[model samples]
Target: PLESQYQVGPLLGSGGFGSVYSGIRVSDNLPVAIKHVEKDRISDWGELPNGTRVPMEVVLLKKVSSGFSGVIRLLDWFERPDSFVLILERPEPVQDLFDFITERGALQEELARSFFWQVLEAVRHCHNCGVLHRDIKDENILIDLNRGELKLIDFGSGALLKDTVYTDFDGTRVYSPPEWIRYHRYHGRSAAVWSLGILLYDMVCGDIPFEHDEEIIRGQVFFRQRVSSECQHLIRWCLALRPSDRPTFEEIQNHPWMQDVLLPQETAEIHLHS
Candidate 1:
């Protein structure tokens, strides 16, 4: 705990809602991320099933585990009348895959396939369990290229997500589907698939994806729809106007094109070059 001096080590990252601090656990001396939400954080983003925008992450986490195991973990949470404490897994060193594509021009087909396969495995478990990860983007897909796990985290925007019509504008515009643009009779998994497709496109060739104003990028993604055949087709299937248009994770995991690909775990060579 960094409470004694209230002084934590290097800052991990900052976001619209809060900031994360890298601190050593007083007991184990192991590093853990302590996320602090300063008083009344950001006008309560949205509401949960019970109608409270403040989600009981600890409670929601009970139903989530091995499904998101390889991904980020939400350790413990303690809320005060004013502020709250959140303990999180210390993500290993990583180079954002979005940035990775930019640095290393066109990616090999094998690597792209590996990433897609991992994503489907995770999504399969989540949707089957009735969990709708409303937000699925490069930012949510954490990569351990060395360990070969493309995990997901940050459920702040996710929900129980049963079969229902999504009416609100919740996710980043860039990855939203055409229905989202229209904002009516919109579906859930279909929206997730759209973002997943964006990720697939990103792992191969991305720059204009997550790095700009939402409106412009949204126009590009929804209007252009440019990418390789496999991804575009898969996304097209996922983004179909009807929920029936999307394929099950079981189907995607075994798709001949992606099911078999030779990818080397080259994340070991990750270097900051600073």
Candidate 2:
């Protein structure tokens, strides 16, 4: 059934848990990304609404199925003898934010702000839908070169949202909050905000703010490139050493930096042609 409905194409990439391939939906010829995860790599399982047991990633994807432009959509999934296959939406002419920044060095403040706004809304949508994208990094964000739209990809490190603190960490170490390293526990929102701060710094500075655990704990952010005072303030506020000091998504949205309008020159181009 899967073979008839979809045609798997060339290999896209491989990661710690699985490999993703380019594919297409046969009926409409819609481009898609097919991911295969070996059963052995699955550490946890969750149930769908119908009580069908599936991978936690699938469950979370289904939970956040609303037509949010910023997050990738899961079209279908099926089980193989030894692994599971996931069909995901694949935008054309897309490059990850990591490579995007690597090529451009650092982004302009206005550009970074626009990208950050999309990412923030995407994360907020996930939270509202009872999902926690434990991993939020440039590598996991895909930008469509044609339209400059962003999509948050990869739910491999995701978890169901809850009020309780999370003791275990499965996300990227550099993006992790200092509290998780210091106390081995962190609330969902606080940790997410910390990662967002790191992301913002990386966007504007073209580099991650901290390299060592001590530096992260120290909470000192040095900017090599010029950044606006409001932007710097927001970054510092999000990266506060104490979790409680970090701003909530609501507060971040209301921040002066986020409220600023784009300049005419900045508005002229949103797509990345180079």
Candidate 3:
């Protein structure tokens, strides 16, 4: 059925969990990404509304797939004897933010601002849908080179959002909040905010702020490149040592940096030529 409905093409990439392939929907010719994961590699499971058990990633995708443009959509999925195949919406001419940043070096504040806004919006939407994308990093974000649009992808590390604290983490190490590192437990929203801080720092500074656990725990961020004071303030605010001290999504969205309308004069000049 899958081979009839969709034609799987070249291998896009492979990772610890699965391999993704470029595919096309047979009838509509719509491009898609096909991910095949071995059943044994799945560490968690969730049930669909129809009572069919599936990967937690699938369940999370189903939750936010509708009514959200920032997140990658789940077109369809199928189960095999020893593996599962996921058909995901694949935007064209896109690159992961990691590779984009690597090629371009540090991004201008205004450009980074635009990207950050979209990411925050996506995260907010996911939260509203009761989904937690535990892995929020450059590699997990896709940037449209032509249109400058952003899409949050890779929900393999995601989980259902809950108010209770979680002791385990499946996300990146550098993005983990201080509380989680110290106490082995953290609330979903606060930890997510901390990852956002790391992401923003990576965008503006061309690198993550902390490489060592001590640095993350200390919560002292030193910017290699000079960014706006407002941006620095927001990063620091999110990186607060105490989870309770971190800003909520509402506060982060309302921060002066996020609300800034005027670009710096130097940045404005750069924008005009580019």
Candidate 4:
């Protein structure tokens, strides 16, 4: 069906709702992920209240992808007679954070700092744009090994943050905040902070701080290797029992530990490496 615009290749993956294939844009020869989904394969599919269905992920990607460096770009999409096709950029030297961690055990603190800072900025951008990436996990975060570049992918579980509170969640259970487990309700920023803590700890230790749902809800994080006091302090703060105690994105960016990493010079270095 995409013969006119793409040279489709092998299958990349298949989720319950759809399958993704590797493809290249016929015009520019750019690599892309072509997601094909039969209308019946999509779960809980519904009309947009205007009597026509819509792909929320496509809607969101189009809304926030422009000028946002942290997200994967959606080049185009179309609905054929039997399925929906989404064209997405397929970056090179890409590896999921989970595999990256498995390979290196853990990243050097300085390197982790670089990647984490970018993630913070990315999440900040999303939050600022009124988007909530309900699912923030290593598997969903893609990394360009060559430059340590991070790009957040997979928006199937995402939603617009129309209010301060959410009762239902469509994210990894391990990353859920204590309040979410306890009350089934959480604020976006707090949940985002919680996931960041999980991501940071995983990156630094090559393992998770909490081993189970009980530990995640308990919120006491243990360390393996020696982590800087300031960094550990930030981790603890993000995993605070009360959502209010977790630092805001602004506070996180200004934290003592992050000050040097987010320095103007470091920003230049990131681009220099890229």
lDDT string, candidate 3, 141-181, tens digits? 99755555678998988899999989888889999998888
Against the reference, the lDDT scores of all candidates come to 0.60, 0.89, 0.88, 0.78
Model 1: per-residue Cα lDDT over 109-219, one tens digit each: 566777667777777777765667766776667666456566766665566766778776555666666666664546677677666766666665543344444442243
Pick the winner on lDDT between candidates 2 and 3.
2
Superposed on all Cα atoms, model 1 deviates from the true structure by an RMSD in Å of 4.9
TM-score of each: 0.76, 0.95, 0.93, 0.87
Candidate that scores best on lDDT: 2
Instruction: Itemize residue pairs with steric clashes in candidate 3.
Output: none
Per-residue alpha-carbon lDDT of candidate 2 for residues 1-274, written as tens digits (9 for 90 to 100) = 6568988899989987499999989899999999999999988799989898899999999988867778999988999999999999999977899998999988998889888988998999999999999999999999876666778999988999999989987889999999888899999999999999999999999989998899998999998999999999999999999999999999998999998745323433643643
Candidate 4: deviation at residue 29, Å?
Answer: 0.6
Candidate 3 root-mean-square deviation in Å: 3.1
Best by TM-score: 2
The best-first sequence of candidates by lDDT reads 2, 3, 4, 1
Error of 1 at 33 (Å): 2.0
Superposed model 3: Cα runs more than 4 Å off: 260-274
* lDDT against true structure, model 4: 0.78
Give candidate 4 misplaced runs (Cα > 4 Å). Answer: 1-3, 38-52, 262-274
Steric collisions counted per model: 0, 0, 0, 0
The segments of candidate 2 whose C-alpha lies over 4 angstroms from its true place after superposition are: 261-271
